[model samples]
Target: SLERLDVGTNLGNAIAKLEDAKELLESSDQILRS
Candidate 1:
């Protein structure tokens, strides 16, 4: 359905954002430790 497609796109975007945030956190952690 159209609603499902919309939800899927939104979910995908959220997941991508989370992945970016995780990468940023890991970089920050490494910098702080060093």
Candidate 2:
């Protein structure tokens, strides 16, 4: 069922980008200072 949607690659990239965004947001120092 999942393969039929061709969402494997898209899901992987989305997860990767989400992780990157999470890391960036977590490590950001601007919010506390602002």
Candidate 3:
């Protein structure tokens, strides 16, 4: 079960970084502003 949980956690971080990269591509200071 821990192995599955580890995969789940990695998937979450993967998607989060994916969206973060997408947002940064817009060339705005949205996340950087805070």
Candidate 4:
């Protein structure tokens, strides 16, 4: 089950990174339409 857990953890990290990117883009003054 460790392999599956690792995969899930990595996926979660990737999603968190994407969320960060989205927030960063939203907070910017340029290239952000919303």
CA RMSD for every model?
2.8, 4.3, 6.6, 4.4
The residue-by-residue lDDT of candidate 1 on 1-34, one tens digit each, is 3544357888999999999999999999999999
> Tens-digit lDDT track for model 4 on 1-34?
3544357788989999999998887789466565
Error of 2 at 21 (Å): 0.5
TM-score of 3: 0.56
Candidate 2 residue lDDT tens string, 1-34: 4555577898999999999999888778667677
TM-score, model 4 to reference: 0.63
Task: Please give the TM-score that candidate 1 achieves against the real structure.
Answer: 0.78
What residue runs in model 4 are displaced by over 4 Å at the alpha carbon?
1-6, 30-34
Q: lDDT value for candidate 3?
A: 0.78
Question: Which candidate, 2 or 3, has the higher lDDT?
Answer: 2
Off by over 4 Å in 2: 1-4, 29-34
The lDDT for every candidate, in the order shown, is 0.91, 0.85, 0.78, 0.81
Better of 2 and 3 by TM-score: 2
What local lDDT does model 1 show for residue 34?
100
Alpha-carbon deviation at 28 in model 3, angstroms: 6.1
